[PDB]
């Protein structure tokens, strides 16, 4: 199926040219709302700590997924765990404070902590990167998080992206090593 | 008066994959408003079909063509953890779900002079029982389902590969115990030999029409 | 909407669940772009 | 018989912001009728808008008209944590807020007398980016959005500061780390430099009619 | 009303959640002060 | 405000035949397709019906026809866990259910030559309070529910055993203390006594159309 | 469907609960082999 390449025009062939009819597949496990939503783990043994969502480690699906997209938009749902009485969490921009009253707060139960998390910062949407005067010939602003969680006790945190929406694709990688072997083979149960 | 009521053992854990939503904090906070913000895309398999990436020969995504004889210019597995697939786009997006179904589309750029010529041809060979082989010359694999074609004013060729197997779907990840491929080889036979001289073809693939993954995993890397 | 569903509905308001969204008055590109390609074969098909 | 159900792990734990609703303990109490009560205010943003406050010059809500050059009556920025702002209805308001939007609006009321003129302007800089500057003279921040008014019949003078902003809400704290205002300086100048003798503006504020605040907080002072 | 919200309603009868209020038979202010407000510029107003 | 409910002791605990079913992990799967896969049964005793299994003569499914007297070729108790059924599939499906109603089939199908003639009968004798017996010709047997057949061009024969008992199910296992069986035997009697030679008999047994087990179990064995 | 049951139903949605079953398009054996059967006597019966 020649065609020129350099008008960058998109091209998807299917085995029809050879004789083949493929039906059309309705993807759902692909779908971007239905996979950034789940309870990734992102940190242990940690009081205070600002919830920003780049902390999620960039091997797990959820993470590097989230780094595959430059921009994204997300109500968030935070669950701790561990040993802990209760949970302080200040909405995006409220001022620091060793001590905390009146700020919202959720007691454990069964040393579980879940609670959603309302889109808290004034940008129209977040950024996974930000071209701060970074000119290179060859680290994001603190504005950029959901809020400011801090824990009675150091506790598990987990994260869950809720209403999420990416914005411009970025790329993924694999994380495993081919080694001196080109084809990676891995162990399956 | 109050309602009876049975509270289960096994259920009401924590669960990081489960439907139901957590309980409020704030109220009635009013997020600012994303219309003409550009680029939104809802499904991965979108940008993996519009957005073809170029796949690893060494280092370097083009093939050069090569007096000597040869002619198997590559012959790599149809397989995302191949060593070709490191650096594209689907080989990280399968990385992470565990299976899948449907055609891949690979798009052959030749980019030599335009009065050099060349003429080229790619086969899809299917899973063996394959003792080896794999066919090192093009009248060897001509019988196998392949397409041929010389460079003109349009430099670029999409060759589609077939999903063929016994089964619906077919793993992403290789089975640690493998003596031959599961999902087949594809092979791009250069077909004349006297070429001077040099002369690249870029290679790259991205997802068919009909292409599908299912099962999100989050595998321990490494 | 996503990952979630159930045969009864959210106890809460929607305010209380989920910010709300407002339009710039007092989307989607990718899907438009996939939709783009042509598929159909080039040049004189024969055969 | 018994309706199954699953108590969940990370639920009803004490909320001291949650939407429900505790159990009573009396019933059948009837309050005494509150008709003509006067002066309730459903909302704190309207008390805000309907009674502007005095801003805190060194103490001292109003400024001084001065012979010496100078001519920079007050130079300050458009943030509640300044300390002209200390004393002001707004700043002990947006104390607790956490983010905000919209125009301020400034009161200037001329209070010399009869014979004594004078003519003023109030000038807007926008954030920088300013390496200092600010301008120090009419002529210099004439470029700038500005206004200005001379005395009369009619003493007050309202001007009404925009809010312009990349981000849609700005905090109302500072940052602790900045050396440069996010929010922008407001100036006011007097213009001729010959005033015997004395006479003074009094200088107030009051929320404009589109300013928002959002999400309460209770921060520890200190 | 206030900070309350749910699908539902409060399982307890009104009499018993709330105290009743009671009519003077057998109101607010600073809205209507903030609407009084004249925002029309004063004078006459040229370009 | 919160609803009022009441858990209760003695329930909620885990259950391994209980009606209710367990939380969602991973959603929208779709599994491919089964049609055109045959073979589906949807109930044992289809077929156990369509599928009669061969019994356990002392470890050959036939009868040898013999010249001596004796003429009790089989005298068997219709009973699951006699040892003739012992390798039959009713046995081994019984071996599961704790009770059963309803009649019994045994294919009888003559393999002699095709000169060599005979003559059979069976009857089904119900459970006494028998004194021993059981009668041991035919004769004797005739009084008896019984059928009788002579080899001809249609080998096969099927004989009904009727359920007589006086309670409307009765145990597939044999309680511990007996003298006496508690659903009656079954004898295949040759009726004439002069073979030369050898012949056989092969012996079936599938479930009748109105046969019906009840109440699964899951006895340890041994 | 099976040993399941209750006046109501199930709280998650099918889509949770149960893996979809997909047509091929963009049964059963043994019932219909037991009713095959020819209980009718064979022959001329008589009496």
New interface residues.
């Given amino acids: 199926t020649t065609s020129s390449g350099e008008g960058a025009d998109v091209v998807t062939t299917d085995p029809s040219t050879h004789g083949g009819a493929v039906t059309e597949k309705k993807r759902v496990h692909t779908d971007v709302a239905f996979v950034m939503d789940r309870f990734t783990h992102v940190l242990t043994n940690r009081t205070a700590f600002a919830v920003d969502l780049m902390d999620t480690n960039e091997k797990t699906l959820v993470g590097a997924l989230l780094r595959a997209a430059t921009y994204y938009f997300c109500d968030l749902e935070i669950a701790c765990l561990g040993e802990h009485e209760r949970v302080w969490w200040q909405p995006n921009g409220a001022p620091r404070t060793t001590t905390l009253r009146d700020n919202p707060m959720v007691f454990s139960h069964n040393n579980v902590t879940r609670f959603a998390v309302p889109y808290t910062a004034p940008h129209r949407l977040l950024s996974t990167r930000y071209n701060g005067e970074c000119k290179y010939t060859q680290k994001l602003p603190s504005t950029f998080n959901f809020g400011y969680v801090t824990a009675d006790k150091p506790v598990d945190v987990y994260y869950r992206m809720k209403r999420a929406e990416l914005y411009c694709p970025r790329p993924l990688l694999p994380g495993y090593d081919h080694a001196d072997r080109d084809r990676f083979d891995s162990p399956i149960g | 008066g109050i309602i009876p009521v049975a509270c289960f053992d096994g259920y009401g854990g924590f669960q990081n994959t489960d439907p139901k939503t957590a309980d409020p904090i704030y109220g009635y906070v009013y997020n600012p408003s994303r219309n003409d913000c550009h680029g939104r895309y809802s499904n991965l398999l979108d940008v993996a079909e519009a957005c073809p990436t170029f796949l690893n020969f060494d280092g370097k995504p083009y093939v050069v063509t090569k007096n000597n004889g040869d002619k198997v210019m590559t012959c790599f597995d149809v397989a995302f953890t191949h060593k070709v697939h490191k650096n594209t786009f689907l080989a990280g997006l399968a990385d992470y779900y565990a299976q899948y179904q449907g055609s891949l589309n690979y798009h052959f750029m030749y980019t030599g002079p335009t009065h050099h010529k060349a003429k080229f041809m790619v086969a899809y060979i299917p899973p063996g029982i394959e003792t080896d082989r794999l066919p090192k010359t093009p009248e060897d694999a001509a019988h196998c389902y392949h397409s041929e074609w010389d460079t003109g004013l349009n430099s670029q060729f999409t060759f589609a590969v077939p999903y063929v197997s016994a089964s619906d779907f077919s793993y992403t990840h290789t089975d640690t115990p493998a003596m031959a491929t599961t999902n087949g080889w594809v092979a791009v036979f250069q077909v004349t030999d006297t070429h001077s001289a040099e002369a690249a073809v870029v290679v790259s693939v991205s997802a068919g029409p009909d292409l599908e993954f299912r099962f999100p995993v989050d595998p321990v890397r490494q | 909407?996503?990952?979630?569903?159930?045969?009864?509905?959210?106890?809460?308001?929607q305010?209380?669940?989920?910010?709300?969204?407002?339009?710039?008055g007092d989307?989607?590109?990718?899907?438009k772009?996939?939709q783009?390609?042509?598929?159909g074969?080039?040049?004189a098909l024969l055969a």
């Fill in positions: 909407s996503g990952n979630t569903g159930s045969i009864i509905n959210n106890y809460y308001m305010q209380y669940q989920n910010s709300m969204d407002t339009q710039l989307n989607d590109w990718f899907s772009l996939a783009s390609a042509i598929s074969l080039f040049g």
